[PDB]
Amino acid sequence: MQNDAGEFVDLYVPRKCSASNRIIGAKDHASIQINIAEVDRVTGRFNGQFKTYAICGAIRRMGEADDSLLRLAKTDSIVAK
Amino acid sequence: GKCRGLRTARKLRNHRREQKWHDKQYKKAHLGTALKANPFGGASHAKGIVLEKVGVEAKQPNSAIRKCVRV
């Protein structure tokens, strides 16, 4: 949100769920922001780069948290098809 | 449920008009009764002549004598 003059008036921009584009509320304790490390092409060791994914509590409680991360890993070329 | 048809203005107008008579506050002000039985006949005040001096007792749990007049 802006103030029609370039002034961002939102005190904090919440994280949207990487699986359902849902706003992760400040009191959504079941929410998860899991990091998935990236490996090297030639040796496959941890270099320091990782990928961030946020899944809200509703998707996680429903049981579609592992399928969402699986599809998100295939999109970022983490796990094989 | 309700009929949301675009030509149901007659059904809605007739249904609402009939169900208003099941209202105790509406049927009291739009009938001959409750006005013919009203001694004042729809007036604010009324004059009269005192006939007796009767005292009715207060209902429970109160205990007193209410000083009334037969007018």
């Binding site: 949100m1 802006q2 103030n3 029609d4 008036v9 939102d10 005190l11 904090y12 921009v13 919440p14 994280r15 949207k16 990487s18 584009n21 849902r22 706003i23 992760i24 509320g25 400040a26 009191k27 959504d28 304790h29 929410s31 922001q33 990091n35 961030t52 946020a54 | -």
Partner: protein, 215 residues
């Protein structure tokens, strides 16, 4: 008298590792220590007891009377909290509810009515809270209308920072215990309603647990 944190979240905010309270709300981190709340908002934070409702428990020898305390706390801009505590003495019930009302302080998103000039004055959209049977609908209002609401939810809306509103409650609003919790629930959805201005892709940042892992 000195604060000794027991959770790793309190250790970070005590060592000046977490700058603003928004980082806690950004990552949905649970605030289990009340000393973290007044660490950031302790300067301007004014509470108010809404009602002391005595509850009774029928026993073999009589009624055990306990007293609740519905305390509404807020910084009057963007943060509001509500806490309920039922103890035997009224003094310890009020002190216990202020601690719970601080732990429940949530951010408050505010928007504009039509044009956008200055600062947000009302709710961004029509949000509706629900608790028990009483529901309250927070509707945006023009710039200078003020909080058009009952005296009970008006305290929550003034302590949250909302200046203008057009509320419409339905249900047993005589129950202040459910009326206040329903109003506090309607303010919880201001930062949970996806609007077109929040359609940009989320850029993630290191969480305070990860940024200060070794510390």
């Amino acid at each position: 008298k000195e604060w000794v944190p027991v959770t790793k979240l309190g250790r970070l905010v005590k060592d000046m590792k977490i700058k603003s309270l928004e980082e806690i709300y950004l990552y949905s981190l649970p605030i289990k220590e009340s000393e973290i709340i007044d660490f950031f908002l302790g300067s301007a934070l004014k509470d108010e007891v809404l009602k002391i409702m005595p509850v009774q428990k029928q026993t073999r020898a009589g009624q055990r009377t306990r007293f609740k305390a519905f305390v509404a706390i807020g910084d009057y801009n963007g943060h509001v909290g509500l806490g309920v505590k039922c103890s035997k003495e009224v003094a310890t019930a009020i002190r216990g509810a202020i601690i719970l009302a601080k732990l429940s302080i949530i951010p408050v998103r505010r928007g504009y009515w039509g044009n956008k000039i200055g600062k947000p004055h009302t709710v961004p959209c029509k949000v509706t809270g629900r608790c028990g049977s009483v529901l309250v609908r927070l509707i945006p209002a023009p710039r200078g209308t003020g909080i058009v609401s009952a005296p009970v939810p008006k305290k929550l809306l003034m302590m949250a920072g909302i200046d203008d509103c057009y509320t419409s409650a339905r249900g047993c609003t005589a129950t202040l215990g459910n009326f206040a919790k329903a109003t506090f629930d309607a303010i919880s959805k201001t930062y949970s309603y996806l609007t077109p201005d929040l359609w940009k892709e989320t850029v993630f940042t290191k969480s305070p647990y990860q940024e200060f892992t070794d510390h």
